[PDB]
């Protein structure tokens, strides 16, 4: 009986709607994040269950702000709204209070806060997804965080989520080092993900992006050296191929 409100607790505690939401997450695609000391690499694989469907149309790697991207595992529809609501809160709360994009630590709290509301009301369901959010800021360095449909956030050095989580997680535990390059971290990433699938593994269907060091290329304006380009950069298929060939 305690399952089906959000209002009913079990005798043992906890709410079911949060528990069942976590079940949902784990059905979604295999996505993983590794924190490095000069980057963060965030990676997922993609499908469409029909080759007719194009694969750029989907985006499962989205820059949230120019310095902070995110992925998911879980239900597709829920991601797309929640990223819209997050960009929109990012401006309200912090791009009018700093006049630029918020630090990573801040924005984790704000997105986690929309989850908290989608549990608080009854007759409104949680969101179906768990995010990884990785970004970089000027005071806490490079960073990685997990934001659960619970409305709780957890800081992570490395984690994985989704269908291949349990296997990916033990591979990460062993293979991670405390000091890795951005470049080495990409190789641990492609490889980890290749556990989840083989023979249909190619750079076309694998989306893999980074938050590294500034790029002056995607800044789009030049002559003002007192602002930094996007820390986020999305890598293309052909570039992922260079790294997959090099393995």
């Amino acid at each position: 009986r305690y399952s089906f409100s959000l209002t009913t607790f079990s005798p043992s505690g906890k709410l079911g709607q949060i528990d069942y939401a976590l079940t949902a997450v784990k059905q979604g695609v295999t996505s993983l994040g590794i924190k490095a000391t000069n980057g963060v690499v965030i990676a997922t694989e993609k499908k469409s269950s029909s080759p007719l469907a194009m694969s750029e149309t989907l985006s499962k790697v989205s820059l949230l702000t120019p310095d902070i991207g995110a992925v998911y595992s879980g239900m597709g529809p829920d991601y797309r709204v929640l990223v819209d609501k997050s960009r929109k809160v990012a401006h309200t709360s912090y791009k009018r209070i700093y006049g630029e994009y918020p630090p990573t630590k801040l924005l984790v709290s704000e997105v986690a806060k929309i989850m908290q509301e989608a549990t608080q009301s009854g007759g409104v369901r949680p969101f179906g997804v768990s995010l990884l959010i990785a970004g970089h800021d000027e005071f806490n360095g490079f960073s990685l965080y997990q934001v659960d449909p619970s409305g709780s956030y957890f800081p992570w050095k490395a984690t994985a989520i989704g269908k291949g989580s349990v296997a990916a997680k033990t591979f990460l535990e062993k293979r991670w080092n405390d000091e890795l390059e951005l470049e080495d971290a990409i190789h641990i990433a492609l490889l980890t993900l290749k556990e989840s699938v083989e023979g249909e593994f190619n750079g076309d269907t694998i989306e893999l992006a980074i938050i590294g060091d500034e790029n002056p290329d995607l800044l789009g304006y030049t002559g003002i050296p007192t602002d930094k380009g996007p820390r986020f950069r999305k890598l293309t298929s052909q570039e992922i191929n260079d790294r997959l060939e090099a393995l």
Partner: protein
Amino acid sequence: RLDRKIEFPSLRDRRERRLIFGTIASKMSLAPEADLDSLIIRNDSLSG
């Protein structure tokens, strides 16, 4: 109870995929046109 706990792989290394494909050869002689090794690559989650 309950002394011996036996684990099975189910993702399977190439080493274990090969053995169950190798059951075909034991069972009956097969064509030089056949290549078993082709099948070990394409697998990713395939039990016996």
